[PDB]
Amino acid sequence: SAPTNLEQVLAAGGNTVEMLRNSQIGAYVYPVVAPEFSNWRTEQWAWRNSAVLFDQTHHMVDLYIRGKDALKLLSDTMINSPKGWEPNKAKQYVPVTPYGHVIGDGIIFYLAEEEFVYVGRAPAANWLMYHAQTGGYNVDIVHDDRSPSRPMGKPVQRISWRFQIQGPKAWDVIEKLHGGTLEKLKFFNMAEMNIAGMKIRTLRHGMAGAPGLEIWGPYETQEKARNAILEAGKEFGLIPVGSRAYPSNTLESGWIPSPLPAIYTGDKLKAYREWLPANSYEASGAIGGSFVSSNIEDYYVNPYEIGYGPFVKFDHDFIGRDALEAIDPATQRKKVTLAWNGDDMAKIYASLFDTEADAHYKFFDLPLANYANTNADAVLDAAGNVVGMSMFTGYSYNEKRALSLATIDHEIPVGTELTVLWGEENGGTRKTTVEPHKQMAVRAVVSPVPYSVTAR
Amino acid sequence: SAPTNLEQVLAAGGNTVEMLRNSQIGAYVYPVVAPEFSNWRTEQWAWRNSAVLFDQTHHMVDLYIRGKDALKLLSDTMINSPKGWEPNKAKQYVPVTPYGHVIGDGIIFYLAEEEFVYVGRAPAANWLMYHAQTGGYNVDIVHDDRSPSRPMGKPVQRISWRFQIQGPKAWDVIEKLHGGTLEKLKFFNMAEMNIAGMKIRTLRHGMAGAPGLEIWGPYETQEKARNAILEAGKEFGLIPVGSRAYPSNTLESGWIPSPLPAIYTGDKLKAYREWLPANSYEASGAIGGSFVSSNIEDYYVNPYEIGYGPFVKFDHDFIGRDALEAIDPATQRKKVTLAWNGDDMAKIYASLFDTEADAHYKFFDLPLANYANTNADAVLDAAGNVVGMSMFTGYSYNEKRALSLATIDHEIPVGTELTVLWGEENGGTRKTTVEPHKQMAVRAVVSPVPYSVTAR
Prior knowledge:
Number of helices of chain A: 12
Radius of gyration of chain A: 22 Å
Assembly: dimeric
Structural class of chain A: alpha+beta
Helix content of chain A: 10-25%
PDB class: oxidoreductase
Chains A, B: Vanillate/3-O-methylgallate O-demethylase
Number of strands of chain A: 19
Largest interface: A-B, 49 and 49 residues
Keywords: Lignin, Sphingobium sp. SYK-6, oxidoreductase
Entry title: Vanillate/3-O-methylgallate O-demethylase, LigM, protocatechuate-tetrahydrofolate complex form
Distance between the termini of chain A: 57 Å
Oligomer: homodimer
Number of domains of chain A: 1
């Protein structure tokens, strides 16, 4: 009798860490969008130097949440304050478990009265659906999964298309599309703009000091809007970004996309494990990197550790509030950027071209080097102690640096040189993304988030 | 009045070399098939160590050629001997111009009486269609283009699916599918096999000393056959190869896919230039690499130069026969593999991680480094003279070596160390695949084709 939910998967499947670190799921794919339109180096360059069109239509789960208790469902499950929240304002929704640990996160758009949409990775979407179905909420939900990883020529549909226009010249492009001045609202406030005779809803955004917009609409008008954007942007050098360059943007922005959903342990989470399908992200996904523990809870984070502390407001009842109130924020780990030593990167790549070596270092793909849903590399100080966890890894052509986002012990000063253990032990796990390799301790300098160059 | 054919494009567009070397076409893409299924290193490894399923359904043009003069059309345009050619035998069709130069090449399957299919890149397909339409042949042709480079979620259709099963364990997989012994015919002879209760046509193939098959059928049965192949092959470790690893296979096999179609000059080719669309491969494509000449004919090759000499048979009338008869085969350039120095590869990659350098070396993607339809890097001897042209470039995880296929002066001995000039001049051309960079002279050792390790 094959397992039908996560609880049965774990009961039948040995140590939880060993299962996730040897999963056969393969790469975490950003699907459908062409890998490259020009080349990923020029594409990274454009979001810092001209303008870019980010195609966000395919790599996130969307949950359309409607009804009388939609707001209450969100309030009951989020660390964020609901006080004063009205339509045309979005929030970065962060739910934690009864034990205080991050499940996931996403953007929640307050569209109209009793109308919300969640956009983000699968784990927080699963959490919302579970509470919607079992918590006695007068709410109706439409789940629109992210697109398949390998469509192999099949047609792909979404309910909505979602673009961002970003870069130092983004607002020039936006105003050209709109046909006049468009007011820059406060961050995450929503409005509308003109695009090719359509009224397109907007979300105020930005990056690297330059304002931009996220825009969306019904899937049927996607090509109409894309072609108008590309046409208007040629005057300003706007180019489309492909799926190869795209996810590396967050190494500069500083958002960690991939906390392990902290749901594998704890008696109060058993009912959720019994609800989660046996083929869910949680049951079928993977953990990759050098950080090894036999306890899966050692991979969990709480919101203070990955930069969500400022969102926590004890002004509403929510799951895990008691646990969060008990935490001392001043002693929690802190999110940082790690700037990887360029000479060590050179050593990693050189080993691919050594015809004599018994082994080479773990392949570091460009510009995104992750090789699992959840990334967990050990961060070490000079005495060999584990002082943090590196969670998202790649390279910026803008910086000419490899970079990772990490959470490290609070007392470590900016500018400190640590090491990141790159690669897995004993020749590598059985993940299909992993070729045989030996490990290397890469020197890395603690740097601010968002990244800014830091002296040693 | 916009140009409608290649002749008008060239009349209006300045120097032909400058146009092709600055084309905005972007990358030559191997479309639709997932970039990776496991990872490209493991995938390369499997075709030398277990078995692989190559998905060849999307990256080639197919021409279905039927009628009384189909064989005559082919005979009239090919260097190959037609004598004794009967159904269920395939040939590597190679057409040359009246001036003796290679237009392109592909595989032509003699399916039945008066029934052929061409499979290969666009240039030889365009040549056949041109002669079919203008040469007074009683023939009917169905053109099935390769799939679009960036489908962006649209459905994609072909008339036929096309797979290869290759590797040291390929025949074990084939016989398991067939349900019994299957005779290994002579190379490129065609037969049939059983797959999931269907009769599938086969073409005898192989690589690296191990026999294999190419198989095809109507697009509608693709999934039925793919799933049967993957299922039967699990016992032998067969895995699917994605589009990232796939094209690198030919660096080990030794076939050059990308000769420039030699059709841009010559009065007897003007009528063909007037037929070719303004958006054809010929008119819109690109040339990339360090080899610079202001004369486009300096990029042409004749069949002796890229290993097709043995196919030339003066036993039939064909276009360019007089030119080929006038050539001395003993003094022509010769196809070789160039094994790139691993320390120089390390230097190329190291420059991506230098935060101080004014420039870095041209980005060398893995495992395929090409950045245009047609590749042309200058090969130099120790005195700085140009002694050859490198035409297809990448890396083999099987060899732990970067490799290119090249044509070089006949007198150069195997084992000689030359240099390949990697990258373009003056910061790079305007091709959208090219980031700003400086050039490097990479040491390379002349080696046999198919590649085999050669001492300096």
